[PDB]
């Protein structure tokens, strides 16, 4: 049925109790629990509606079960109403769903109040009732939804609900591009450094580690993350979910920490350049990246596979047990423990050592007025690094801290978006740390093959 699909993209789906536009406790696919501000009253109504102790959380099956009931209860409410029934009978299948939509939203006795537009609706004068419905509180309260229902009423088509498919297939396109950019980018980088011995420097050994983490992310994390979002489900095991999210945290931790290692690498190459090649050896270099991945392993696979990350609230417990749920619920402890160890500590180090580099550049910039190309290009690169890095990961790791401190603040969608903003940073890294003339030559050679 189309009325079922229509309401699914009008009410969405939330397995936990939330507040709708009017501030009423709602759950599932737009099922009003109570018009009272009492959470306990809402939780009691949910328990009665489902038939078990819910803790404010239901399942997807229980959501569609309540959904089908609410739709049926709306149709019955129309047929029993003596002012709505002649209109419903008059309307076609598509326009019927539009009427069911309003009743689903405002109730049978609430829709019946629209005397003027109900008349114009039965008279089949669509364009009249179209602008007549716009002059109501229902339109002012929910502008985006009312326009979709009114459009369906005056056209008799589903063109108003055709946007959802466009944004999905469009998002599927841009996700494919991201995956392609990350893989093509980092493969080209790792290949170039490996094949050509001239590029194998101490600094560029760190970039290989970075490009490796970024590569695995573009191969393992991002593609399966795109499928999880587009299909709106997880078509793999609970094992594969716990394995996939491990690679997520592992690669992110490795990627960000390696960015920090590069930063400290340049710190010694700028502040104490005469000791640089003595402090940082090829041997010490691989020792550092060993520690990076060793650490990253202890923040990803160890806490996750041992179920130390797991939260304790009901929605998490249901998610962990559901073979089609792969939402990343974490306890407050692991969240802030993994956040500081995979971002904030690298951040404060990165800001410190780059502040010092900023000083050393400005200091030399004061000595001579012209021909300061080295310091100018340093400052410019310095901006691009801290710019794209913080702009990509800081918002995510801010809301990552917030959502485990005060819930009902950070939405699911915005956690995903800001996390994917961090994902594309893996695609940006080959555009930042591989700009050298020797990289450009190595790239024009591999692509000319």
């Amino acid at each position: 049925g189309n009325i079922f699909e229509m309401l699914r993209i009008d009410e969405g789906l939330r397995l936990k109790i939330y507040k709708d536009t009017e501030g009423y406790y709602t759950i599932g696919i737009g099922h009003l629990l109570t018009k009272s501000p009492s959470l306990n009253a809402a939780k009691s109504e949910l328990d009665k509606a489902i038939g078990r102790n819910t803790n404010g959380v239901i399942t997807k099956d229980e959501a569609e079960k309540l959904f089908n009931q609410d739709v049926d209860a709306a149709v019955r409410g129309i047929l029993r109403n003596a002012k709505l029934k002649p209109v419903y009978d008059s309307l076609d299948a598509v326009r019927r769903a539009a009427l069911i939509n309003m009743v689903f939203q405002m109730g049978e006795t609430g829709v019946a109040g629209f005397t003027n537009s109900l008349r114009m609706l039965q008279q089949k004068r669509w364009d009249e009732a179209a602008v007549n419905l716009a002059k109501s509180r229902w339109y002012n309260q929910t502008p985006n939804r009312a326009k979709r229902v009114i459009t369906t009423f005056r056209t008799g088509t589903w063109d108003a609900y055709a946007a959802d498919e466009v944004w999905v297939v469009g998002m599927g396109i841009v996700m494919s591009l991201i995956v392609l950019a990350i893989v093509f980018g980092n493969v080209l980088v790792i290949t170039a450094i490996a094949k050509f011995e001239r590029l194998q420097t101490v600094t560029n050994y760190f970039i290989t580690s970075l490009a490796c983490a970024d590569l695995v992310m573009g191969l393992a994390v991002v593609p399966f993350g795109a499928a999880h979002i587009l299909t709106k489900t997880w078509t793999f095991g609970n094992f594969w979910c716990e394995f996939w999210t491990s690679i997520d945290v592992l690669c992110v931790t490795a990627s960000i920490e390696t960015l920090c290692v590069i930063a400290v690498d340049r710190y010694f190459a700028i502040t104490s350049p005469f000791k640089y090649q003595s402090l940082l050896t090829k041997n010490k270099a691989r020792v550092i990246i060993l520690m990076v991945w060793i650490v990253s392993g202890l923040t990803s696979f160890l806490p996750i596979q041992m179920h130390w990350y797991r939260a304790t609230h009901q929605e998490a417990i249901n998610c962990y047990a559901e073979e089609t749920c792969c939402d990343f619920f974490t306890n407050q402890a692991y969240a802030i423990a993994s956040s500081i160890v995979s971002f904030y500590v690298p951040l404060v180090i990165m800001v410190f050592v780059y502040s010092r580099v900023f000083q050393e550049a400005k200091r030399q910039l004061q000595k001579i007025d012209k021909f300061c190309l080295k310091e100018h290009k340093a400052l410019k690169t310095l901006g691009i690094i801290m710019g794209t890095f913080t702009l990509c990961w800081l918002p995510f790791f801010i809301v990552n801290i917030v959502h485990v401190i005060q819930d009902n603040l950070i939405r699911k969608e915005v956690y995903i978006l800001l996390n994917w903003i961090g994902y594309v940073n893996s695609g940006f890294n080959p555009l930042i740390y591989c700009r050298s003339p020797d990289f450009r030559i190595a790239f024009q050679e591999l692509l000319c093959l």
């Epitope: 190309l373 080295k374 340093a378 050298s436």
Partner: nanobody, 116 residues
């Protein structure tokens, strides 16, 4: 990998002259900015001379007029001809090629000691 080897340092009478050579191998030399740095014992390192890709040379106030830096792209070598040397010029002189923040390569550095 990238390599910068200095040669031409050592001992020299005060007022004497030395010529530092810096051989480069492993990168696109011609499109790199070259500088000569030095570091006296127990002191902060300082810039001696520098030459751009265009050929623009710039020097420190203390060695201006005495030292002369030049570059040979055909041989991937940058030189630092330094005359009228002084006991203050006694330091470890290092070669440095640079493109951006990450493409910054240094030499091992050669010791120049000036005394009578």
């Amino acid at each position: 990998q990238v390599q910068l080897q200095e040669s031409g340092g050592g001992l020299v009478q005060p007022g004497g002259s030395l010529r530092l050579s810096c051989a480069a191998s492993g990168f696109a030399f011609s499109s790199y900015e070259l500088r000569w740095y030095r570091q006296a014992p127990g002191k902060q390192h300082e810039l001696v001379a520098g030459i751009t890709t265009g050929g623009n040379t710039y020097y420190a106030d203390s060695v201006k007029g005495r030292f002369t830096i030049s570059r040979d792209n055909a041989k991937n070598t940058v030189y630092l001809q330094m005359s009228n040397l002084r006991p203050e010029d006694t330091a470890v002189y290092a070669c440095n090629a640079n493109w951006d923040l990450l493409s910054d390569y240094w030499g091992q550095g050669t010791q120049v000691t000036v005394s009578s």
